[PDB]
Amino acid sequence: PLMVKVLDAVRGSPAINVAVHVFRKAADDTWEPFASGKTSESGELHGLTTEEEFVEGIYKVEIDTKSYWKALGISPFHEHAEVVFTANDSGPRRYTIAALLSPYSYSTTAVVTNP
Amino acid sequence: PLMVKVLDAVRGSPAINVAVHVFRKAADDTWEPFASGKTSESGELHGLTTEEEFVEGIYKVEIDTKSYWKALGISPFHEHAEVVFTANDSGPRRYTIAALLSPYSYSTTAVVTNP
Amino acid sequence: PLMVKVLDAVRGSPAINVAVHVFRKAADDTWEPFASGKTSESGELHGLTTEEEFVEGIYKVEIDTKSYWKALGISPFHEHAEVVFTANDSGPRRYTIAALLSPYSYSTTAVVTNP
Amino acid sequence: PLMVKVLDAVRGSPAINVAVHVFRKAADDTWEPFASGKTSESGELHGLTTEEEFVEGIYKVEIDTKSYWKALGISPFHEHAEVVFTANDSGPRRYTIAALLSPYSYSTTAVVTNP
Ligand SMILES: CN1C(N)=NC(=O)/C1=C/c1cc(Br)c(O)c(Br)c1
Ligand SMILES: CN1C(N)=NC(=O)/C1=C/c1cc(Br)c(O)c(Br)c1
Ligand SMILES: CN1C(N)=NC(=O)/C1=C/c1cc(Br)c(O)c(Br)c1
Ligand SMILES: CN1C(N)=NC(=O)/C1=C/c1cc(Br)c(O)c(Br)c1
Ligand SMILES: CN1C(N)=NC(=O)/C1=C/c1cc(Br)c(O)c(Br)c1
Numbered sequence: 066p067l068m069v070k071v072l073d074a075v076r077g078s079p080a081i082n083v084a085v086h087v088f089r090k091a092a093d094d095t096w097e098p099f100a101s102g103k104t105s106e107s108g109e110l111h112g113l114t115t116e117e118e119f120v121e122g123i124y125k126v127e128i129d130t131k132s133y134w135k136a137l138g139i140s141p142f143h144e145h146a147e148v149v150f151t152a153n154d155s156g157p158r159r160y161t162i163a164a165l166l167s168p169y170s171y172s173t174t175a176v177v178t179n180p
Numbered sequence: 181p182l183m184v185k186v187l188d189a190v191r192g193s194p195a196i197n198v199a200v201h202v203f204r205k206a207a208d209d210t211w212e213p214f215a216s217g218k219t220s221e222s223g224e225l226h227g228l229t230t231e232e233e234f235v236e237g238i239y240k241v242e243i244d245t246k247s248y249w250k251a252l253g254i255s256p257f258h259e260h261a262e263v264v265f266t267a268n269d270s271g272p273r274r275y276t277i278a279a280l281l282s283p284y285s286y287s288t289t290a291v292v293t294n295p
Numbered sequence: 296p297l298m299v300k301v302l303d304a305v306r307g308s309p310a311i312n313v314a315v316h317v318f319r320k321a322a323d324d325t326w327e328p329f330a331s332g333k334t335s336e337s338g339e340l341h342g343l344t345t346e347e348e349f350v351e352g353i354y355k356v357e358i359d360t361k362s363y364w365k366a367l368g369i370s371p372f373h374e375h376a377e378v379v380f381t382a383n384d385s386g387p388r389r390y391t392i393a394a395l396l397s398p399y400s401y402s403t404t405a406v407v408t409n410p
Numbered sequence: 411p412l413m414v415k416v417l418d419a420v421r422g423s424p425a426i427n428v429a430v431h432v433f434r435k436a437a438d439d440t441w442e443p444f445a446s447g448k449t450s451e452s453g454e455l456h457g458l459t460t461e462e463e464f465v466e467g468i469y470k471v472e473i474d475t476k477s478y479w480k481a482l483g484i485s486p487f488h489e490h491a492e493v494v495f496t497a498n499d500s501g502p503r504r505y506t507i508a509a510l511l512s513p514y515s516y517s518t519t520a521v522v523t524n525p
């Protein structure tokens with residue numbers, strides 16, 4: 066139900082080995098750890114959560130962009146990219162959180178499907 | 181070797197049934213028809229060409245965005261989105277041409293892989 | 296030295312009356328309030344800080360995109376757009392933080408100039 | 411009434427000295443030259459046309475992105491960025507055509523205002 070995809074707009078490629086941390090806003094309004102991983106050779110991170118565990122709520126996806134650009138010898142602007150959204154608030158959905166990265170810019174979109 | 185993917189940034193979904201026409205710049209410098217199709221339920225168009233036929237050159241991918249937005253009752257700015265690029269000019273590659281659409285904006289990127 | 300500009304990709308217009316909150320990372324590694332305001336009729340927010348006060352550090356620009364869309368007869372995907380970056384690490388610069396908004400996507404860029 | 415602005419997502423700067431060519435679709439359905447220029451140090455191109463001359467029609471803005479990148483020690487993906495749109499179909503408007511450039515991606519938006 067939750068997948069993250071990261072692309073590199075400088076090289077025209079998947080962004081490989083990018084670290085991702087996912088949080089859920091708790092009953093008390095603080096950010097509780099939820100899931101993490103690194104992108105694959107296809108720039109994708111699967112297997113973050115299960116349908117059962119991915120209940121309605123506010124989630125934060127942090128994508129560690131800065132370390133990615135440094136490893137490539139390219140000077141970056143942002144510390145990371147943070148995507149904060151409400152999930153499943155009309156019922157269970159499958160989410161792809163995509164990020165397209167440049168050193169001084171990024172784009173993020175959600176593709177939300179109903180099985 | 182050539183795939184086109186189209187996303188809708190208003191609805192957060194694949195852009196389905198979007199018409200695509202692909203041209204190749206000919207020896208004479210004019211735009212010759214090459215391939216066409218419509219996006220699927222996943223917003224993807226596969227099977228445009230074969231490795232054999234997809235030789236080096238300048239290609240144009242025209243995505244008929246205007247008809248897409250009209251069918252949805254949303255007022256659009258652009259007539260279409262046109263992506264013009266040189267392909268295979270360091271050797272054969274697999275290309276994904278992605279377009280993320282809004283009524284008054286679009287983003288396009290290429291994901292270029294080497295099998 | 297710090298300006299925020301916000302555009303609406305649905306309407307093709309400035310995003311007016313968008314609330315913005317700016318934080319700076321403190322010596323103790325928490326987010327200290329730094330500046331705030333709302334975008335004007337041109338989608339711009341000037342007058343956030345002064346050259347003297349805008350020293351080197353990690354800054355967070357929170358753009359309250361959800362309320363913008365909730366006001367217009369949308370229900371968007373994101374809670375807000377956050378832009379986190381290190382400022383003035385090579386000396387004083389002027390920063391424009393731009394954001395282009397759609398209901399299920401946004402893009403953000405920085406324009407960094409040396410006066 | 412018509413302005414073009416071009417930004418560089420790699421450097422976080424205006425894209426300076428970018429060539430732009432503007433065409434209008436003629437009664438006979440071919441592309442007639444209309445206006446041209448190069449972006450300034452602010453990445454902007456003003457003075458393309460006048461209110462009197464900029465009547466309703468289909469316009470094409472060609473932004474010569476390849477030469478921009480070829481000058482800088484890149485070899486980009488796209489030959490150019492083309493933006494094709496109907497102007498003034500509900501009456502006279504002022505248009506800013508913005509483009510944010512990366513080597514393998516670009517985004518383009520319109521800001522359309524009613525003076
Ligand atoms: C379905 N639904 C409606 N109509 N309004 C909601 O807030 C809602 C939430 C929801 C329901 C289930 Br069952 C589920 O597994 C997940 Br996750 C979310
Ligand atoms: C995500 N994205 C953004 N933010 N700008 C884009 O052009 C874009 C494209 C995209 C490309 C592929 Br390929 C893909 O599988 C998915 Br999902 C999205
Ligand atoms: C490989 N190569 C190099 N080094 N410079 C080129 O222009 C080039 C082009 C090319 C070669 C093959 Br065989 C092919 O199937 C495709 Br289509 C493109
Ligand atoms: C100039 N400089 C260099 N070379 N490395 C730095 O970290 C740095 C920081 C800086 C200096 C001044 Br004076 C200033 O007003 C601001 Br604001 C930032
Ligand atoms: C105003 N108007 C309406 N209502 N429908 C149109 O097609 C239209 C076009 C138009 C009118 C003027 Br007078 C003008 O200077 C420019 Br230029 C465009």
Ligand SMILES: CN1C(N)=NC(=O)/C1=C/c1cc(Br)c(O)c(Br)c1
Pocket residue numbers: 300302391393394395402403404406415417506508509510517518519521
């Ligand atoms: C144009 N644009 C795109 N396509 N993606 C962006 O983030 C973006 C930002 C933009 C930034 C400034 Br500064 C500006 O004056 C204008 Br007019 C637009």
